[PDB]
Amino acid sequence: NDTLKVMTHNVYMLSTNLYPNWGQTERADLIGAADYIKNQDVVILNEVFDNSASDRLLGNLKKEYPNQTAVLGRSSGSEWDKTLGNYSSSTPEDGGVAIVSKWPIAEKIQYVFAKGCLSNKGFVYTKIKKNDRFVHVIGTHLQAESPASVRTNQLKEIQDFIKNKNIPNNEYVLIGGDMNVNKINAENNNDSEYASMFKTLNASVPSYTGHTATWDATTNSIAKYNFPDSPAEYLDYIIASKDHANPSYIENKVLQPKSPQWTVTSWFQKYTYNDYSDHYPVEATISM
Ligand SMILES: [Ca+2]
Ligand SMILES: [Ca+2]
């Protein structure tokens, strides 16, 4: 049809070598079988750092999304058409970004950001063939909270890459992921980092629906454990480049899916959670 469904989710899968008891393996199975992640055309994943759990998750998503990229910054072989940027094979961790789709992926490129405040952070570019139409999806995860200066530099690298690619102006180019750029209380400030994000990427502002935050310690069990008193934030987006096909309609809906209860043990203490990640997923609907 004339609709494209793209979802982005920071799944919080830290390395089990550093955090052995964060339920990474179990959550890989829970997310893989979750209803919220079904029925999409493309899914962008962030923080799939743990090697075993990330591969398990990707394997669980294979049935519905058999076309998959490797995980950003974990390798630099022929699994990528090109490895761009400051890639280092000596980093202690990878970039944690991967893209999966139910449609054939014509091109897969990884790009490692030049600056940061040890993990090959950057973005993954994919050219996807959806029903005789090529769409372009870039998945990324920016510098977490000077950081603003770094994020702007990273966003500039993304825009520069898109421009250099010479992608047809009549094809859709989406940029999605955890931007770590907070929208809350910044929509009216034209000099805010939030406003600057769209200008740096030369992207449009999508219609917002669903929950009012993507990282919410007031409703998310994992975020509550880590930062119980931190105000909710809006950091995840999926937006379209204005230098290419401009969607007549593009929506970003924040979902609040709860997972079956899972338990972990740490320091002789048992902890139970009902969230898939500390971030909520964003479901984008783009009219083509
Ligand atoms: Ca995080
Ligand atoms: Ca890893």
Curated annotation (Swiss-Prot):
GO terms for cellular component: extracellular region. One of its GO terms (molecular function) is sphingomyelin phosphodiesterase activity. Its cofactor is Mg(2+). Gene3D superfamilies: Endonuclease/exonuclease/phosphatase. Its main location: secreted. It holds the Pfam family Exo_endo_phos. Keywords: Cytolysis, Disulfide bond, Hemolysis, Hydrolase, Secreted, Signal. It comes from the Bacteria. It is found in: Secreted. Belongs to the neutral sphingomyelinase family. Required, with sphingomyelinase, to effect target cell lysis (hemolysis). This is Sphingomyelinase C. The lineage of its organism: Bacteria, Bacillati, Bacillota, Bacilli, Bacillales.
